[PDB]
Symmetry: C5
Subunit: 311 residues, 5 copies
């Protein structure tokens, strides 16, 4: 079966629509998400037209095999989509109305710079390759683009699901290709990160700073070193939930900076002890007293600077 | 093959039933479960009717290909169900009796607020899309809804398996859809959490409080800091078995609150030491003596408040 | 193709046999195992009978498609078995001899109460649904039930592979079902648990008890707290290799009890120190001296009691 | 299609050959490996013979469906091999030359006793079941057994790939079976284990022994206990990369033995302290001085004994 | 369908091209990557030639089944590629233009010697087996080799995608094989390793060296031992992201060397203490003072030597 012939030298417009049934498994490390949706296709094949008076019926139902159907593929899917045809309905004028239900693992890049306070734009790219007979162009039937209310993406808030109505038409291997951009705007549910990572991380840091109210070198060494190890544990926990970015993430920046605080706390703890042994506890006292104000102020200011830089 | 024609303008009623054979793999993080069950379908196709006298036979067995079968799909499945037709039996009035055995990974949201003392309602949504010829409506044959005695969901107690008999009939992409809700009520086996997480977590906390019967700053620092790290280990262990909730879970709340107890224990340990060095051990004694009663009382009361709030 | 017609009102007896080729992947957490075996089926279809004189041949070989084959399924499999027909041989009297080679992931519940000294009974349930024409009943041909010598289940000893010869005949969705129980008796190879978990766990506990021969509070605090953490590490290691049981396991019981030993060791260490500071080292000495005998005796006795309760 | 008829009462000899294209994923815990290879089969079917003069052609190419092909299966595969027929070429005398490209996950037991200095013999078992018409026997065409130069098994050295030319002929379910043993001899690349596990493990042990040059009980307790915990971490790391063996492995033996060294080091550290407090530092000095020589000598000798026992 | 017949004794040239659509999942441990690309094939089949005047059409479109298509396979794929034919276009001269869209998990060895500053050459090997009728040779149509702009490999920079135009023609199982090498040059994004592993690892090492400004044996033991454990944690973290190499990697070398620094730091800490107790603090002072300069200088120089050796 060959494509529909043109009235004039016009391209064939295949109207599309994606209706999300189930959206799930957003893998941060793999930068993938799984989708379960309806794909609707509609084009005019004049060869399939009929008189509703003569035939008796108002629409004709065909099996995929029977008629010409455009080869619509997804660009950013890992493997070819699992698709099952729901219905093919031809109107008297030859306006075909195809509907299929699919499921696919979509590969869409994620921006972790503001993690865990980040928002993402997931993409679903519909594509059609033009045939030697005639050129095929994609369109968006906005009436058939949407999502079920039930649709939930665990640990994410679904903002919108829209399509960029004008396709990206380009040449590939000397043939015209019509690409469409279906955008799923989501924003992360940062809540859990606060009692699980952020606050525990701040508590161990504040515990380290109690060394500024202690003259006991042995106790200070225990305080700063122990807490530093809990900080390493938290850094490792965080980097396991994330991929390797060629940029600093917000949480990454905070975590990195906190190492410097531990490093300087050890230096202070060392300096204070050296001075004490050197029979200069008056100078050590001045440094320790300063550190009590210096450490939280420089911490608070450094954080303002980063939130500023990052947001 | 087209759908059965209507006597009058009535919709076609497809009677359904799910009988669970094997239920397994309830993933808390992924909010999914795997099912292995029988799906039974029954509808009237007058075109398939016959005389049992003339034909000799009391029922006719058809291969799926031979006759019209309604396109029944599952809403909340990740990929299309693995189904194998067991039997198709036509009675002479044309009452088709379809049976298939399926397996599917069902995506059903979970409520972790009362974890590990939570109970859940797992869902299985049967759906049918109406055709251009006629409208299809789902029904529940209660005689064919159930589960095998053998059926066990590891670490969960299976309460019930029922169907909401009246379908959710709604329009989707200008066509009628009949949705059915099969509900599997389960409740978690919280037992193991007690000797594995809850009690070990309480023992390390109580060990931290022995610092209230010690004047040794160096020992107290070791006691409180060490136990705090074991608490971090337990917090991490717990959050690995769970997804990121935009709400506090019961265990999450207990765990978070316990950080504050470690924080204040460090403050006490610090205050007591500062006072001792400042040659005011009488005041430090008062604080330490108070802490011995204050810490367990405020702990016990805070827990009453949370269990109250959570249950 | 319809089932064989009955001589009288007798049911059709399908003789079965499972011969294990490869048995592997026993998942303790998932309570599953993978099997690779031969399935043999034999029944009498009088319609397929022939005279060996006239035909010349002593048995006829058919392709599955050509003849009626009973729909034998497995109850406790996650997904439908991957089966490839090896041979179908019909004798002159119409005694069909079907053989297929299959592989399946079988879901069989496990009893962890005596872990790692436990023994299990893995099950393989063959089932047949009776047709409207006639009732089908399963039988066991003991001569075709067995396992290859080569068959090895890693970290387990294979005791036996037998079938419960009398089937469980019951009604399901108003039709007769013949269920057969193939039992694979295995017992765990507990050896490795001894040098990897049990003895290391006992060594850290015994190290904690050296605090009973020390007057140094700071050293005792380090001894008991450090070892307690290694005990937490071992508890976590153990519970990662196991599912969440609504009952205590033998190892679970030992592990839990050992927390109480650490708790009381801290109490002793605390009491001894308090008394020393209170200028009462004579009383502290009595307690410490007692603890040296009390701790191992109460440990040894508590263990006798548990092994007694558990075995 | 029936098997080739015999000239006399001889069995049908199917000549075999496996040529490895890609060998990968040797799972130590699962005792499996994945293979991608060519399978070549050759037998004489007199029915397919032809005159090259009359026909014109020197060999005839058939589609698998067209002719009789022996049912060759693999014994030790988890699931049935993914096979794609490359070519079927019939010579004038009726000598069929089948070639297929397959991929399979082969289950072959591993011996960990000498780990990580172990060598293994991976197996690939070809098998054929005799038919009622005639008996089928496997043979090895050595000219068609081999492996590509490119073939690499990560972290392993491939020694050889040979076939045991005489098949294991035996009865199974009253039918003759011809089994062939394809052996892939490999030996582990132990290199990485030295700077990653062995030496780090020895360094922490030697650090523990510095307690023999210290009179500070508190320091010794820290030294021995800390290092013991790093040893526990290394023991856990090792046992995660390995399955549960009913025997001791070389690394397992070394690791276990090192626990005894930590245990006795604690005993020494305890004894030395008790004696010091008891105002007997002369006796404690003797013990400590001895321990300095005793610990490395008994360590070195114990290791000679084990390497001796193990190799 | 047989292959195209030769004009003279020339081989059939199948022109090839791979156009990468989506490149993803580069597994360092498994040494695999997943690809989603277009495969284009073009050869001359004179039997399919036609007059464009008589036929009317300028190119003819065939279904794969209708015509002879060369059996092109991939050498280094784990399983056979998931391929879906996009188009088959025959020109009047019989120049076939095949296009398919595929996805495959490619197995390509990785060189970790310079990790995480390494660059790799991923391979895709196209292969064709010659038939008994005629020999088949692969060619590269450079105009149909490329990659989409969108193509991103997470944590890697894609340098180039080229094909080695002259095929590797060799005999395999007495038949000619034409192998082509498609090379994807990539280089790792080392950025993240710096704030996540390299700098944290250096901070803990520098913290250990503060023991050179302390006379407190108990504090030094805590400092060096604690930091050593954090170093073990980092070593383990690193070796989990990598496979077991029979060679030293750059990061592996740095990590290993740092153990020696901890070992010698313990020795110094021990020596200094022994001397102090021995009432020789003047000699201990000299050693400690030297260590303050020796440790960073020997560290810095050792690192120059390694970067030199490695790059
Ligand atoms: C004679 C003293 C006995 C102490 C027993 C402790 C009982 C703890 C019960 C926990 C039940 C759950 C909260 C934990 C505090 C630990 C006890 C501190 C001991 C102080 C000794 C002072 C010496 C005069
Ligand atoms: C402290 C740690 C204590 C360890 C408990 C010992 C195991 C035990 O007592 O477990 C009992 C097991 C189970 O053997 P069974 O045949 O299944 O018992 C069934 C007997 N009935 C039917 C009478 C109930 O005996 C063994 O495997 C003994 C050898 C293992 C010793 C390892 C100790 C270190
Ligand atoms: Cl697609
Ligand atoms: Cl363009
Ligand atoms: Cl074009
Ligand atoms: Cl479905
Ligand atoms: Cl089954
Ligand atoms: Cl096989
Ligand atoms: Cl391939
Ligand atoms: Na079509
Ligand atoms: Na149908
Ligand atoms: Na059949
Ligand atoms: Na300490
Ligand atoms: Na055949
Ligand atoms: Na073809």
């Amino acid at each position: 079966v060959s494509p529909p012939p043109p009235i004039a030298d016009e391209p064939l417009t295949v109207n599309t629509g994606i209706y999300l049934i189930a959206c799930y498994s957003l893998d941060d490390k793999a930068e993938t998400f799984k989708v379960n949706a309806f794909l609707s296709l509609s084009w005019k094949d004049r060869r399939l037209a009929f008189d509703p008076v003569r035939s008796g019926v108002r629409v004709k139902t065909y099996e995929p095999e029977a008629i010409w159907i455009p080869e619509i593929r997804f660009v950013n899917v890992e493997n070819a989509r699992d698709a099952d045809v729901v219905d093919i309905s031809v109107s008297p004028d030859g306006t075909v109305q195809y509907l299929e239900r699919f499921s696919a693992r979509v590969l869409s890049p994620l921006d972790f710079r503001r993690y865990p306070f980040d928002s993402q734009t997931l993409h679903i790219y519909l594509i059609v390759r033009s045939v030697d007979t005639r050129n095929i162009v994609l369109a968006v039937d906005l009436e058939k683009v949407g999502k079920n209310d039930d649709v939930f993406l665990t640990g994410w808030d679904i903002e919108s699901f829209t399509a960029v109505v004008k396709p990206a038409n380009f040449a590939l291997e000397d043939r015209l290709e019509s690409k469409l951009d279906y955008q799923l705007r989501i924003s992360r549910q940062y809540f859990s990160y606060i009692p699980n990572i952020i606050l525990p991380m701040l508590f161990i840091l504040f515990i380290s700073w109690t060394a500024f109210w202690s003259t006991s070198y042995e106790a200070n060494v225990t305080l700063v070193v122990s807490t530093l190890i809990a900080h390493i544990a938290f850094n490792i926990l965080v980097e396991t939930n994330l991929p390797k970015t060629p940029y600093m993430t917000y949480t990454g920046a905070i975590i990195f900076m906190i190492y410097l605080f531990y490093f300087v706390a050890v230096i202070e703890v060392t300096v204070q002890h050296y001075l004490k042994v050197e029979s200069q506890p008056a100078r050590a006292a001045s440094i320790t007293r300063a550190s009590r104000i210096a450490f939280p102020v420089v911490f608070l200011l450094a954080n303002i600077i980063l939130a500023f830089l990052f947001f």
